[PDB]
Amino acid sequence: RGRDQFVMYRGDTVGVFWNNEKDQPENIVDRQHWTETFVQWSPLGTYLTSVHAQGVQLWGGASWSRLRRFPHPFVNLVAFSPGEKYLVTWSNRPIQIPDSGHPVLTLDDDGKNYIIWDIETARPLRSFAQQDIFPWPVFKWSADDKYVARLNQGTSISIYELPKMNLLDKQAVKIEGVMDFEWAPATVQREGVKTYEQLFCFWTPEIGNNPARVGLMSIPSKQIVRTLNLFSVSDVKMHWQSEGTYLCVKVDRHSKSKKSQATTLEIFRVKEKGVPVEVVDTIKDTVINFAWEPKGDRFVIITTPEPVGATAVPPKTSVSFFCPELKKGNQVGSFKHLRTLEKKNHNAIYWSPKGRFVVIATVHNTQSSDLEFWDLDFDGEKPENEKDLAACLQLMGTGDHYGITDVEWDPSGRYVATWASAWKHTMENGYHLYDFKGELLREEHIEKFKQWQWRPRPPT
Numbered sequence: 239r240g241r242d243q244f245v246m247y248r249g250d251t252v253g254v255f256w257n258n259e260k261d262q263p264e265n266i267v268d269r270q271h272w273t274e275t276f277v278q279w280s281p282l283g284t285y286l287t288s289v290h291a292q293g294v295q296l297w298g299g300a301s302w303s304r305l306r307r308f309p310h311p312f313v314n315l316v317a318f319s320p321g322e323k324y325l326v327t328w329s330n331r332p333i334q335i336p337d338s339g340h341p342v343l344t345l346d347d348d349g350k351n352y353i354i355w356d357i358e359t360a361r362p363l364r365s366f367a368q369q370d371i372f373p374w375p376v377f378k379w380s381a382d383d384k385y386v387a388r389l390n391q392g393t394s395i396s397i398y399e400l401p402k403m404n405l406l407d408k409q410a411v412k413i414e415g416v417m418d419f420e421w422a423p424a425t426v427q428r429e430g431v432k433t434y435e436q437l438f439c440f441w442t443p444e445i446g447n448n449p450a451r452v453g454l455m456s457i458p459s460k461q462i463v464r465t466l467n468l469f470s471v472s473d474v475k476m477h478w479q480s481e482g483t484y485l486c487v488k489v490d491r492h493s494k495s496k497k498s499q500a501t502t503l504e505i506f507r508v509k510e511k512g513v514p515v516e517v518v519d520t521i522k523d524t525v526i527n528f529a530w531e532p533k534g535d536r537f538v539i540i541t542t543p544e545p546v547g548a549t550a551v552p553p554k555t556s557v558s559f560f561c562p563e564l565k566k567g568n569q570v571g572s573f574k575h576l577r578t579l580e581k582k583n584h585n586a587i588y589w590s591p592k593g594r595f596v597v598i599a600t601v602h603n604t605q606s607s608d609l610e611f612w613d614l615d616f617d618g619e620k621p622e623n624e625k626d627l628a629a630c631l632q633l634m635g636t637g638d639h640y641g642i643t644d645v646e647w648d649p650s651g652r653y654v655a656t657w658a659s660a661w662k663h664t665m666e667n668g669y670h671l672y673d674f675k676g677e678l679l680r681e682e683h684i685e686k687f688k689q690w691q692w693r694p695r696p697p698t
């Protein structure tokens with residue numbers, strides 16, 4: 239059938255189900271109190287993760303039997319390395335080790351919040367305490383599970399090499415003023431580089447007589463392969479493309495008056511010689527959403543103007559598409575504005591994992607629930623003003639879901655699930671099942687629907 243599994247957690251019961259489109263989901267399993275607080279899928283779909291006060295547990299196999307156990311007390315957040323080789327557990331409450339003894343941890347782990355585990359052996363590799371002075375993950379992974387890093391804001395970036403979890407060159411990367419950083423989501427083959435490397439971007443604000451900058455570092459050489467100096471900058475956001483082909487930096491800027499001014503989008507061509515940087519566009523309003531097309535070269539933003547009165551009426555939002563120009567040959571033209579939609583309340587972007595199709599949504603709002611299903615490679619005639627661009631934008635269908643909180647695409651990019659979680663509000667928990675086109679296949683009301691989550695499937 240080529241169906242996909244998914245999990246739903248309602249009340250105190252969680253179950254793995256087959257997908258039957260409009261027909262009722264076939265149930266592989268259902269259990270009561272499988273988890274205490276939440277349920278999370280392993281990124282390659284191998285494990286189902288349950289969380290308890292004592293520990294976090296990994297369920298899997300045809301039997302759906304226990305596979306691994308990680309005795310971290312009172313975990314709130316859990317993350318995996320991209321290749322499922324390692325596990326990261328976090329607790330807001332610092333670990334308290336009993337004098338009686340802990341079956342795995344020791345006094346060295348007391349007062350700490352993070353633990354990094356080796357899944358295969360279930361043994362803890364390192365323990366870390368909370369930083370001096372919400373976001374997740376904090377420990378960020380390289381694409382190949384070889385490096386994991388944490389930001390020491392204003393000072394350095396501590397990079398560790400696995401499986402030993404040893405500090406690289408017995409030193410943290412000194413970067414004065416470093417505000418944030420992101421690894422590339424893939425192992426990038428830059429042109430002409432024969433050596434192994436992993437890439438991450440970072441940024442610093444203005445320091446003394448040096449301007450604010452965005453950097454691109456190669457690990458483990460720790461060489462900076464490209465710097466980009468920026469001016470009049472309020473804040474910087476760094477957005478990697480899925481293959482690591484492109485890196486877009488969003489820059490919040492200001493006037494000499496230091497009033498809010500404009501936002502600039504600039505793009506790195508990471509694979510190309512010299513690492514060229516291009517100035518895409520400068521936009522007046524603030525950006526509240528940004529999303530690259532997975533495995534593609536298209537991205538969407540959602541903007542909203544600045545409020546002066548903090549007025550009762552919600553701000554309307556504008557969604558804009560950007561795509562590269564058509565270019566003769568196996569190359570990609572310069573990034574250009576494609577189209578801006580009419581003002582509306584949208585505030586969420588959900589690209590398909592395949593990346594042709596994107597769902598523009600309106601979630602966590604009481605005034606509107608609208609859903610839009612768009613195609614970027616529609617078999618149609620491009621309008622005159624958008625004719626040179628490498629895209630054919632077309633609305634494939636609309637939909638709605640009252641009190642919607644979340645949406646998730648299926649791995650195959652054929653189905654879109656939306657749901658109202660009990661975690662945010664209890665008024666009308668439900669899940670909708672759509673296809674890519676936006677046709678409502680089925681919906682269902684569950685009294686205490688906590689979460690839907692597709693089971694990830696890596697391409698064979």
Ligand SMILES: [Cl-]
Nearest residue numbers: 239240241242
């Ligand atoms: Cl099947």
Ligand SMILES: [Cl-]
Nearest residue numbers: 475488527528
């Ligand atoms: Cl952003």
Ligand SMILES: [Cl-]
Nearest residue numbers: 527528529587
């Ligand atoms: Cl987003």
Ligand SMILES: [Cl-]
Nearest residue numbers: 649650696697
């Ligand atoms: Cl697939």
